[PDB]
Design a protein around this ligand. Structure first.
Ligand SMILES: O=c1[nH]c(CS[C@H]2CC[C@H](O)CC2)nc2cc(NC3CCCC3)cc(F)c12
Length: 186
């Protein structure tokens, strides 16, 4: 269960999100930005953030990233977040989880934010608990262990490039909160 508030171009949140989107997608046309309010998903996410904060020390565990999807997946995502059934439909090259882009222009590709019948594209601005990350590979359904001494001490997410990331993979729904849906067109 969830609700969705459309933000007005005059609200600080709209402008914050638009600004970040527009850093690589200015030449596209924003039609609306919606804030997604899903209590259970948000409660689960904040619980995961508390334990991750008390584990990774000084690490800034949270990044805001982009996720392009088809119109048909918006209801499933607003309702159950980036759950396993959704990840099944994501790429594999860096593991079997949900894929998130540092730059909007990556997520805006038609391959990901597929234009619907009316030419409308959908990209989420997502809160993701990236935590401590390592290089991903095709065989992962969860991040590797850091050490063999402790095989239950896992990296929090994986990436294409640890020092210069372009994307991150999350393997659990409670690691990614879809705060904002950007609806836009070419
Ligand atoms: O924004 C993205 N969204 C997505 C979801 S795809 C979408 C297609 C329609 C289905 O119903 C729902 C899933 N995947 C990504 C992957 C990326 N990279 C991988 C690709 C090739 C190896 C790495 C970079 C991305 F930005 C993104």
């Amino acid at each position: 269960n969830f609700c969705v508030v459309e933000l007005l171009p005059s609200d600080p949140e709209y402008n914050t999100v638009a600004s970040k989107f527009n850093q690589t997608c200015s030449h596209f046309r924003i039609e609306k930005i919606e804030r997604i309010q899903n209590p259970d998903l948000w409660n689960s996410y904040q619980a995961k953030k508390k334990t991750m904060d008390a584990k990774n020390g000084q690490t800034m565990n949270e990044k805001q990233l982009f996720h392009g999807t088809d119109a048909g997946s918006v209801p499933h995502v607003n309702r159950n977040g980036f759950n396993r059934s959704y990840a099944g439909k994501n790429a594999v090259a860096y593991g079997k989880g949900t894929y998130f882009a540092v730059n909007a222009n990556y997520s805006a590709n038609d391959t990901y934010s597929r234009p619907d019948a009316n030419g409308r594209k959908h990209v989420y601005y997502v809160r993701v608990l990236t935590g401590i990350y390592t290089h991903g590979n095709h065989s992962l359904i969860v991040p590797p262990s850091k050490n063999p001494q402790n095989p239950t001490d896992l990296y929090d997410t994986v990436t294409d490039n640890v020092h210069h990331p372009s994307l991150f993979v999350a393997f659990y729904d409670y690691q990614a909160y879809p705060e904002y849906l950007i609806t836009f067109r070419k």
